[PDB]
Amino acid sequence: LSYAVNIVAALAIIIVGLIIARMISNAVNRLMISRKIDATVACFLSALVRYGIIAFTLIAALGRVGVQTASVIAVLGAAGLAVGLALQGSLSNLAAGVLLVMFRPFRAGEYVDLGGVAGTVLSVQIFSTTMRTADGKIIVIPNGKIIAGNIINFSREPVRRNEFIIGVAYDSDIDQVKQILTNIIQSEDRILKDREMTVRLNELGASSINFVVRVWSNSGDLQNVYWDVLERIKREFDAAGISFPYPQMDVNFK
Amino acid sequence: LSYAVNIVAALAIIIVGLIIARMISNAVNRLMISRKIDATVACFLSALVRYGIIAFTLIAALGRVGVQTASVIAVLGAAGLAVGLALQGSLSNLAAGVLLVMFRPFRAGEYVDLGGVAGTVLSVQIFSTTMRTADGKIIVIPNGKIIAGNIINFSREPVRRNEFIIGVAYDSDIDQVKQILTNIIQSEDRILKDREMTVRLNELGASSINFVVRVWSNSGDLQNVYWDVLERIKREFDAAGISFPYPQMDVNFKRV
Amino acid sequence: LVANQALLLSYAVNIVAALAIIIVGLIIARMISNAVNRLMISRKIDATVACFLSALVRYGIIAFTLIAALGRVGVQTASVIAVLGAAGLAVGLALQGSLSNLAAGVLLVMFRPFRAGEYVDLGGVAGTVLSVQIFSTTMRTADGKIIVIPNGKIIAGNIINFSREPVRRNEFIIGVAYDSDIDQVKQILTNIIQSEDRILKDREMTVRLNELGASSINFVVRVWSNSGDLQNVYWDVLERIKREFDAAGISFPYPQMDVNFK
Amino acid sequence: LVANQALLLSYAVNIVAALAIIIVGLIIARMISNAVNRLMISRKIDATVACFLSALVRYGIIAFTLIAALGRVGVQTASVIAVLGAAGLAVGLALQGSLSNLAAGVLLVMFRPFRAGEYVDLGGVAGTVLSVQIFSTTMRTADGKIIVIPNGKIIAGNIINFSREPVRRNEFIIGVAYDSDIDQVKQILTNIIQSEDRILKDREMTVRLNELGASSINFVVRVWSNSGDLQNVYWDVLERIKREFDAAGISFPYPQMDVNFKR
Amino acid sequence: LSYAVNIVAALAIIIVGLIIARMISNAVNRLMISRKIDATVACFLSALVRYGIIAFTLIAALGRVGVQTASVIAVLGAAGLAVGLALQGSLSNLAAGVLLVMFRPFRAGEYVDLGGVAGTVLSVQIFSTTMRTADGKIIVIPNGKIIAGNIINFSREPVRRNEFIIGVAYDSDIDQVKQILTNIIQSEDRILKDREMTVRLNELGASSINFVVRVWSNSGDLQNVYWDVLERIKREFDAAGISFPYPQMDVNFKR
Amino acid sequence: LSYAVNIVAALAIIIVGLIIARMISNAVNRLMISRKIDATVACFLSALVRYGIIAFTLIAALGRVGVQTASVIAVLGAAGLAVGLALQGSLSNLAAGVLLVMFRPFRAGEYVDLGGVAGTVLSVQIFSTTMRTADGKIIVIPNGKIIAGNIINFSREPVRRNEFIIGVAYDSDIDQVKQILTNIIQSEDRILKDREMTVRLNELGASSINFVVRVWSNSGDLQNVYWDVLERIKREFDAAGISFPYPQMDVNFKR
Amino acid sequence: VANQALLLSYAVNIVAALAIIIVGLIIARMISNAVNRLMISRKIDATVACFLSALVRYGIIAFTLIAALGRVGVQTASVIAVLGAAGLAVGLALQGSLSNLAAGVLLVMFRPFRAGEYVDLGGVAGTVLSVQIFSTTMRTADGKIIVIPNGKIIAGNIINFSREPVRRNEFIIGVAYDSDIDQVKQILTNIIQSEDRILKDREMTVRLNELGASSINFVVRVWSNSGDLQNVYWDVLERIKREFDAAGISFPYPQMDVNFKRVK
Numbered sequence A: 001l002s003y004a005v006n007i008v009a010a011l012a013i014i015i016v017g018l019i020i021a022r023m024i025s026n027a028v029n030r031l032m033i034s035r036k037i038d039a040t041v042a043c044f045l046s047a048l049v050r051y052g053i054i055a056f057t058l059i060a061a062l063g064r065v066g067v068q069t070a071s072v073i074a075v076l077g078a079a080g081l082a083v084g085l086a087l088q089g090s091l092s093n094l095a096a097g098v099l100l101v102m103f104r105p106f107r108a109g110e111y112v113d114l115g116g117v118a119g120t121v122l123s124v125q126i127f128s129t130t131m132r133t134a135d136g137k138i139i140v141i142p143n144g145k146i147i148a149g150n151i152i153n154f155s156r157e158p159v160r161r162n163e164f165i166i167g168v169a170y171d172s173d174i175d176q177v178k179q180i181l182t183n184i185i186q187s188e189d190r191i192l193k194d195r196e197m198t199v200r201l202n203e204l205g206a207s208s209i210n211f212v213v214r215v216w217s218n219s220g221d222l223q224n225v226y227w228d229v230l231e232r233i234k235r236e237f238d239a240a241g242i243s244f245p246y247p248q249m250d251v252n253f254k
Numbered sequence B: 001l002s003y004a005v006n007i008v009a010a011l012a013i014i015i016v017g018l019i020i021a022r023m024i025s026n027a028v029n030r031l032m033i034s035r036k037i038d039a040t041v042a043c044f045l046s047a048l049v050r051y052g053i054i055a056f057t058l059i060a061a062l063g064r065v066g067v068q069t070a071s072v073i074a075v076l077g078a079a080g081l082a083v084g085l086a087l088q089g090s091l092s093n094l095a096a097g098v099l100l101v102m103f104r105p106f107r108a109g110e111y112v113d114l115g116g117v118a119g120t121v122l123s124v125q126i127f128s129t130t131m132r133t134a135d136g137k138i139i140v141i142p143n144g145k146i147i148a149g150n151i152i153n154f155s156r157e158p159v160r161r162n163e164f165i166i167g168v169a170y171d172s173d174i175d176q177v178k179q180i181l182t183n184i185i186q187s188e189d190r191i192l193k194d195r196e197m198t199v200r201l202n203e204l205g206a207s208s209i210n211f212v213v214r215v216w217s218n219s220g221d222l223q224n225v226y227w228d229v230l231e232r233i234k235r236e237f238d239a240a241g242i243s244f245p246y247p248q249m250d251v252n253f254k255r256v
Numbered sequence C: 001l002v003a004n005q006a007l008l009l010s011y012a013v014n015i016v017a018a019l020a021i022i023i024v025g026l027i028i029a030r031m032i033s034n035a036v037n038r039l040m041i042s043r044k045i046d047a048t049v050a051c052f053l054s055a056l057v058r059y060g061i062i063a064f065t066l067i068a069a070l071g072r073v074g075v076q077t078a079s080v081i082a083v084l085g086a087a088g089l090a091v092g093l094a095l096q097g098s099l100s101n102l103a104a105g106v107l108l109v110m111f112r113p114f115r116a117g118e119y120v121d122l123g124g125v126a127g128t129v130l131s132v133q134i135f136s137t138t139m140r141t142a143d144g145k146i147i148v149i150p151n152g153k154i155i156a157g158n159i160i161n162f163s164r165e166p167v168r169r170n171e172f173i174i175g176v177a178y179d180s181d182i183d184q185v186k187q188i189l190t191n192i193i194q195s196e197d198r199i200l201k202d203r204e205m206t207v208r209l210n211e212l213g214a215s216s217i218n219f220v221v222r223v224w225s226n227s228g229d230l231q232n233v234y235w236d237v238l239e240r241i242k243r244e245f246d247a248a249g250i251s252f253p254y255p256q257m258d259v260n261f262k
Numbered sequence D: 001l002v003a004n005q006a007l008l009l010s011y012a013v014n015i016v017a018a019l020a021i022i023i024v025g026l027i028i029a030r031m032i033s034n035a036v037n038r039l040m041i042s043r044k045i046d047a048t049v050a051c052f053l054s055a056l057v058r059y060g061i062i063a064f065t066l067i068a069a070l071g072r073v074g075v076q077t078a079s080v081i082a083v084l085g086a087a088g089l090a091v092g093l094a095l096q097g098s099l100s101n102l103a104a105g106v107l108l109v110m111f112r113p114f115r116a117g118e119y120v121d122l123g124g125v126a127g128t129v130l131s132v133q134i135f136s137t138t139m140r141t142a143d144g145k146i147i148v149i150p151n152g153k154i155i156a157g158n159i160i161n162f163s164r165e166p167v168r169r170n171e172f173i174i175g176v177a178y179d180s181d182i183d184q185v186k187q188i189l190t191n192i193i194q195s196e197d198r199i200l201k202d203r204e205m206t207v208r209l210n211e212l213g214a215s216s217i218n219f220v221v222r223v224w225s226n227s228g229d230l231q232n233v234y235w236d237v238l239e240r241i242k243r244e245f246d247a248a249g250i251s252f253p254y255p256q257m258d259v260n261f262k263r
Numbered sequence E, F: 001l002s003y004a005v006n007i008v009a010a011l012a013i014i015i016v017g018l019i020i021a022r023m024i025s026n027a028v029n030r031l032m033i034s035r036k037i038d039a040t041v042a043c044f045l046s047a048l049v050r051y052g053i054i055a056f057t058l059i060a061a062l063g064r065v066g067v068q069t070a071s072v073i074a075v076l077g078a079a080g081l082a083v084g085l086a087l088q089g090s091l092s093n094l095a096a097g098v099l100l101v102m103f104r105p106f107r108a109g110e111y112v113d114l115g116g117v118a119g120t121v122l123s124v125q126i127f128s129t130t131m132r133t134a135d136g137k138i139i140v141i142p143n144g145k146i147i148a149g150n151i152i153n154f155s156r157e158p159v160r161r162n163e164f165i166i167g168v169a170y171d172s173d174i175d176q177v178k179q180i181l182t183n184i185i186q187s188e189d190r191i192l193k194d195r196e197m198t199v200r201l202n203e204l205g206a207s208s209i210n211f212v213v214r215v216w217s218n219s220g221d222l223q224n225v226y227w228d229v230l231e232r233i234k235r236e237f238d239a240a241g242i243s244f245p246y247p248q249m250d251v252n253f254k255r
Numbered sequence G: 001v002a003n004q005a006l007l008l009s010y011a012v013n014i015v016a017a018l019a020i021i022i023v024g025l026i027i028a029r030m031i032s033n034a035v036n037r038l039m040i041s042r043k044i045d046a047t048v049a050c051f052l053s054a055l056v057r058y059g060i061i062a063f064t065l066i067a068a069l070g071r072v073g074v075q076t077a078s079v080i081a082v083l084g085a086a087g088l089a090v091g092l093a094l095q096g097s098l099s100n101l102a103a104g105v106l107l108v109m110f111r112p113f114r115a116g117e118y119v120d121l122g123g124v125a126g127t128v129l130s131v132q133i134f135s136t137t138m139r140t141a142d143g144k145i146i147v148i149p150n151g152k153i154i155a156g157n158i159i160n161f162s163r164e165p166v167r168r169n170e171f172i173i174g175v176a177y178d179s180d181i182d183q184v185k186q187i188l189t190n191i192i193q194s195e196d197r198i199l200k201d202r203e204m205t206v207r208l209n210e211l212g213a214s215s216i217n218f219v220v221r222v223w224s225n226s227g228d229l230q231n232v233y234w235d236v237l238e239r240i241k242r243e244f245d246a247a248g249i250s251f252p253y254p255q256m257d258v259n260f261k262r263v264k
């Protein structure tokens, strides 16, 4: 009879194998964490070391009860592949997560645009990243999607550039317009003077002459510099009698 | 002759194998559920443990009736692959379902936007999620599709931000306009005063000066704060003689 | 080789055995694969799922049979697997789309996101479901067109169901001249929706100034009715708004423009 | 090796046997694969399905034949599988699109979402179906263009069929000036569609104020007719709406604008 | 020592195999071309018959110098796969080329639209098709791309259909307008009279009443029938005092 | 002990194999280049012949130190596959490069449009093609991308066709307009007279009658013929009192 | 306790298995560094030499594990299967990065752009800062930092604004329908003749280009050095304005002929 002996041996092997798997796979895990390898990378790789051993164990254990060696590979292969398909997206997001943490194209707290979606990063989870839009919406984007696309970071550079486009009537003095605009941006102290300070006639529009003005400020200042400068342009041009034209039209009666 | 003995043995093995499969695969299932592993994950994995054993059983059983060991693998392989292709989408939705339950980017009852489709979540089924739009339509979105895309959640933050853009005639007093607007948002108690309260000249438009106003309120209040504040802006500006301009045009006459 | 006929009829026996095996195998395949099919159908498993799975049980046995049968005429065991493998794969590619539609068909039947007779929108295509066939779903548009959409395509996308909820919501946006009394406009609109008995009064009844438009003030009105009523409530309420505002001297403004002569 | 000719003609026998096997195999392939083909066609299985499946039965046998034939000249059994495998795979890739179109062709014939002669819209392309070939479908547009669409592309997408239903629905949207009598407008329109005998009276006959437009009030009119009638019912009804409204002094407004002068 | 004998045998086998490959693969090629099988199909399939034999030869030849039988399959497999990837697009274009030749959805000289690109087909090469646009641009489209998409053929039907849409002022006589238009298309002999001849009030536009006119002519005539008919519509309506309205607008003053 | 002998033999085999690989793979390379096979094709294929031999060498060499024959295949397989994935895009661009050189849908110096990007081709590198836009931008497009899409060639045909669309007021004499336009294109010698010379009333527009004019010139002339002809149309119509209408509108007053 | 002949008997294969792993790991280190130095010294790219050396390393660890696990009875096909799966798992996870890695090499190797050049990579323009292992960083004209994956970059078009030393401005000027075509051209030609930053040995187009709805449109095309392009446009444009105003050439507003009626 002595089938009983193989059946208990098969269980013994499974038990001994499961235990020797736990320890070898923790040993390797501590070893990589202590060598400053990423926690998730060390985790993922240790999990493989674990199941590699369970696999070898099942092969030997099922082997002793006559289950053939190719059959175990085939079956486990299928199982692995089934799990593989189910875990596929997550595995990809997992990896992206590691790379975002590892290379930090953005950091929690930075305003970014990830595929036409902008807001301030809260956190980068294992599989996805959370951000808060300027108006309090919480957006959750999968890590894989993020890393496949462009990452625009508004916060990384300390200094940024406003552009104004102002339209004035076709009969404005080009010199006066420029002078006034230049005075405005000269007197604004939040405008960096050691950088570009463009003030030019840019376009001959349908109903107006368009002047471009480009001026750098610190990120923090950018918003208010625009608003403040714009209000001055309004008041100054009104004072100087420079017209902001409405839509124009020549009409020919019959 | 004694082929009969292999044929009965083959059946015996199938029967004994099917029974020993049931129990080993339930044992492992209860073990996972009791260790607080997800019900669907524990189910999926147990189903594999089950068929792994049926596979080993069929190999040994068909083996004893002379069907070769590689033939059984090939055939079962093909079958598995056939089923694999058919079950592929669902398997992916199944997994997404687990992750939505597990990480709860949204919860039943939250207003969300899943790929340009907005409404309040009813439930997250095994393969798909159901929501009701603001006007009573029921939308059913596959879980996989949801988790591949962005998940905008309107309900998660307690505090949210209205923006108003008001256009006034080019001859309005910038100071007056701002003052009035500021008085309106100061006197509204549903507007959080410890947060942003922006009131600025924002744009020199074709026919109007455009002021932006940005003010935070609780999610619940957001809708009505907008409506209420807007109606006041109208009445106040009308009282103060601030003009909401119609489209403008300078026309220069001639005769042919 | 006239005289060398001991090893001749010797082959004949394998050739007949090979046929015998094919025949016996084909018969034992039919029965085992029907037995399994009845077993599933009787255990309340879907007819198509039970069919699909039984078909596999069938060909698995024909495969084993061909291997053994071709085997006894010397065709090697790996060759039969390779060849059948290729054949299977060829059929596999040809049947791929259908297999996917087949599965979607099962799931639409099984979970019924929609039911025959419901107005639905499947990927920007709306109409009333007629049936869900094995591979595709048929619907009739509001104007009598028959659209046939593959099941797989349906289940991959969103399914908007107009019919599932018993109660639905109309939105009206009405534009009135900038000199209208905000209070009067609201009052009139509120009277209209109060007096409409098909408008559910225990639900939202919004009437608000919504937008300061280029040429008009825009009021939003939002009011729930039963699905069946929704269409006619809109039409009826809209006609009243027209007649009432006209009576009250509330102007629906045309496009506006201030023109400055030069 | 002049004298060493015992082992020479010894190879000749395998070489002729190899050819004999190829020949016998090719012949036994032809017949077995025709036998199966007639069997399917006679059992009312599709001609193309029966063809495709028979072609596999054929080459399966040629494959077994080549293995045994090349085998008897020492070419090893795994080598033949590998080589034929590659060849098969090469052909596989080249034939892939067609194989998919072939299958779609079968399904279009088999389920007939459309039939030759029906006006259909296949992925934003409309016209009257001429035929469904093995790999693609041909249609003629309303203005005489011939479009050829691959079968696979057709079956992956929506199939809108204009011809399947016998009865279809016109919608008219008519804009009248803001000072029109809502009752009069409706009455006139209703009279027009009542007196049109090609408009089915047992079905919807909607005539409603639908939209308050920028320059006009818009009335919707919806009325069912037989497919054949649909075109002319629209034209005929529209012309009447014009003449009737003109007679009744109901104005079709031009674009409107209030203009406020200054200097 | 006698390794030298295996090494020469290995070369002998390679040489004998290469020669027996050439002939068997030409024999098969002539057999197919003579049985009216496509030149490219017969070529492609013969090339496989060739390398199948070189493969068997290398296996046996490398075998007699001790290189194991699975190793040769693995290595050649890899090589084949490397070439496979590089040749993948072309193989697909090759096949499309065959099918375009074989089924001729279009023929050289026909005006066609292949995926929103129109012009007159010059030729269908092995991998791609060349056409000349109406204004002398040469477009080269890959065969695979062509066969995956729609093929609109303007030249296949002998008879085609013009549509005119004419806008007239809201005060035009519907009967007069129709009559005039009908007279114009009746008197045009290049307009097929046994086919559709639609002349109807089609649309109540913002500034005009729009009449549709639909009339069939031969492909060759279509262009000039349109131009000629259009000029007559202009002259006739002007003569009859039917107005082609400019953009309209009702303006309501104040100040 | 005599493990040392296998270890040195293993190295000997690697060395002998590497050397016999170099020569066999150069021999094949010269053979192809001398038979007028493309330099890149001959290169790619020779590289395979090389590594095939290194593979056989490693199998035999690692074999003699006890590393099993299936293990070497598996490992090298994986390595090959790793390199395969990394080299995949380039391999595809490589092949496209060959085909663009080989079939020359365009040639350096031709103005072409490759997927909505136009300019003059500078060169076709191994993996990508460089062009200069009309305004001095250098665009670099991967070869694979190019060959997958349409290739519009402006330079290939020697003769090309201008189309002018001119709008004149609704009260213009159709005959006069045509006559003037015809005189203009008759007197232009850079307009080929043995080809199409269309001058027709084409469209009844909202504010104007639109005449189409279509006339062929040599590629080189096309640009300036358009400019020159257009300026004449302006001066001639002004002289003849033919009006280029501004936007039109009928306005109906109320109070 | 007594059955200890076959007990310590296993211990030897277990220590041998470890010995093999250790000896294999060490002989892997050196062989894979030896190959790495060999490539780097032969002027092979640092990343290519790295990637290939890493394969040489693990190939040896693989052979080592097979032999080591082999001596403790773990069968030779099992080790291949298991390592295969592991490799494949890692393969999938590393797939995107592997593709970006390769693109990184090719961008460095062929330099379609160089740090400091203004480029447009898939409708995104700015000046390149650096090309990292997996991605490229650029700064937009207004101070935004964009990070684009290398693979995405090489799959698409690369427009380089900085590579050519000479570039071409186009001006389109609209003048009233009653302007003298000759005068307009003459003035424009004088402007571009007198601008010294405009290359005179190259195209200098000034033509009537379009008969627009409300204006005649003249095109002007003129080459300058990359550095000059911006300011040449601005300067030339301002002159066109002042000159035309002086010469009484009108920049027309939108035009319309209006035909009055009196409804009743």
Ligand SMILES: CCCCCCCCCC
Pocket (backbone or CB within 6 Å): A036, A037, A038, A102, A103
């Ligand atoms: C290889 C994993 C150890 C951490 C690497 C950190 C790299 C920083 C790149 C900026």
Ligand SMILES: CCCCCCCCCC
Pocket (backbone or CB within 6 Å): D044, D045, D046, D110, D111, D112
């Ligand atoms: C394989 C033969 C079965 C034919 C199916 C017919 C279906 C008819 C539906 C209209």
Ligand SMILES: CCCCCCCC
Pocket (backbone or CB within 6 Å): C044, C045, C046, C110, C111
């Ligand atoms: C095997 C049949 C299960 C059906 C699921 C029902 C869910 C609504």
Ligand SMILES: CCCCCCCC
Pocket (backbone or CB within 6 Å): G043, G044, G045, G109, G110
């Ligand atoms: C393997 C290094 C080659 C580098 C070639 C450089 C081409 C510009």
Ligand SMILES: CCCCCC
Pocket (backbone or CB within 6 Å): A090, B098
């Ligand atoms: C599929 C779920 C995996 C989660 C690991 C934390």
Ligand SMILES: CCCCCC
Pocket (backbone or CB within 6 Å): A083, A086, A087, B040, B041, B044, B045, B095, B098
């Ligand atoms: C880690 C769990 C694997 C199966 C998920 C469905």
Ligand SMILES: CCCCCC
Pocket (backbone or CB within 6 Å): B083, B086, B087, C049, C052, C053
């Ligand atoms: C739960 C049913 C099994 C899947 C076969 C389609």
Ligand SMILES: CCCCCC
Pocket (backbone or CB within 6 Å): B086, B087, B090, C049, C103, C106, C107
């Ligand atoms: C074919 C889908 C199977 C259903 C499992 C719940």
Ligand SMILES: CCCCCC
Pocket (backbone or CB within 6 Å): C091, C094, C095, D049, D052, D053
């Ligand atoms: C039922 C027919 C099988 C499909 C082969 C194309």
Ligand SMILES: CCCCCC
Pocket (backbone or CB within 6 Å): D091, D094, D095, E040, E041, E044, E094, E095, E098
């Ligand atoms: C008809 C045989 C297939 C040929 C592929 C190019």
Ligand SMILES: CCCCCC
Pocket (backbone or CB within 6 Å): D094, D095, D098, E041, E095, E098, E099
């Ligand atoms: C690629 C050619 C296939 C033709 C089958 C009729």
Ligand SMILES: CCCCCC
Pocket (backbone or CB within 6 Å): E083, E086, E087, F040, F041, F044, F045, F095, F098
């Ligand atoms: C037929 C040539 C082989 C392809 C290598 C680019």
Ligand SMILES: CCCCCC
Pocket (backbone or CB within 6 Å): E090, F041, F095, F098, F099, F102
């Ligand atoms: C990539 C080379 C293929 C060329 C065939 C003529």
Ligand SMILES: CCCCCC
Pocket (backbone or CB within 6 Å): F083, F086, F087, G048, G051, G052, G102
């Ligand atoms: C020639 C280098 C091989 C590819 C590794 C990135």
